Write a protein that binds this ligand. Sequence first.
Ligand SMILES: [Cl-]
Ligand SMILES: [Cl-]
Ligand SMILES: [Cl-]
Ligand SMILES: [Cl-]
Ligand code: NA
Lengths: 185, 185
Amino acid sequence: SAISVWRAVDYVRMPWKNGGGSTEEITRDAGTGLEGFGWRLSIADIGESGGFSSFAGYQRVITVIQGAGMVLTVDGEEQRGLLPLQPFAFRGDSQVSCRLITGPIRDFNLIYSPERYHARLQWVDGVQRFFSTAQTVLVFSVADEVKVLGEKLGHHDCLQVDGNAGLLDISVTGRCCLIELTQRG
Amino acid sequence: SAISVWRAVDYVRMPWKNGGGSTEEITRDAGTGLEGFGWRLSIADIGESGGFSSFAGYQRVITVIQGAGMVLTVDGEEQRGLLPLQPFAFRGDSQVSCRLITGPIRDFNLIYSPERYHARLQWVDGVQRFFSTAQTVLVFSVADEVKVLGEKLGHHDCLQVDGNAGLLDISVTGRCCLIELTQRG
Ligand SMILES: [Cl-]
Ligand SMILES: [Cl-]
Ligand SMILES: [Cl-]
Ligand SMILES: [Cl-]
Ligand code: NA
């Protein structure tokens, strides 16, 4: 089991082509096929209301992490309110748009290919402990200090365990999102 | 002392903001929340001439590992030709641009914070043996087989020893880069 830590102060802001905001890539699988990535973690800055790009064949789970929330319109809609730290799953082929009813928003974005990855996502707080055989475990901090696997994650830092091949026993303290990804087949 | 072996097939690639190329992450230290990584290994794919990101307070050592070579301009100063496997050191704060003259180039990139890490870098071939108290030892292979510490590194695989706390006795065979990093505590 290899531990890597992604520090948010090292993230690179990539403005969107449409000027509606920007993306900070955190990490992703190798995923270099014409098929593309198997999974990707990023933080999206959403600066103005607008539509979301499509990602046919991918599952998305997004979570507001900065800002008071925003409203989403998914396909044929009831409008969905996204509050801070409330994750929201939707298919990547859905037509989705957001309205920034309180100002600009930052989302924590998980996207993965159901064909290629098993996936688990859970926001947690306090002291947590889990056992997992998942190949990749990610811990994304939204606190000043999330302690996990001997590391201290600051704000939007992300710890990544890779190449797990046994049962990991992981304790976490603090407000963070736990993601577990395992290659299928 | 824990050994990880990063396999080049799993190197996560990220494209550059300006589109000039891409960076494959090899490994980086855990860093801190405030100051980000203290060091990083990566392979940069340079597909177009152009400028290099600046990294104030960081020291860089880059080495052409694929392609016939390229020309650097460091600040406004004289051109530097980088030939395959000739390491070149420069400050992260210097404005640096490269001119491709033979096509795209791949660089092995070391970066570290001199305030936070002692560092050593040496390209070697053949049989090597060294003793080092360094806390982290990385061996980056540019050969089909580099034997070190009972592992076998293939093309651009990278061995990493962490948390060494005595005098390591390390033997290496084959064409590779030896990097040693120690926190300045
Ligand atoms: Cl999007
Ligand atoms: Cl995404
Ligand atoms: Cl660069
Ligand atoms: Cl670098
Ligand atoms: Na830094």
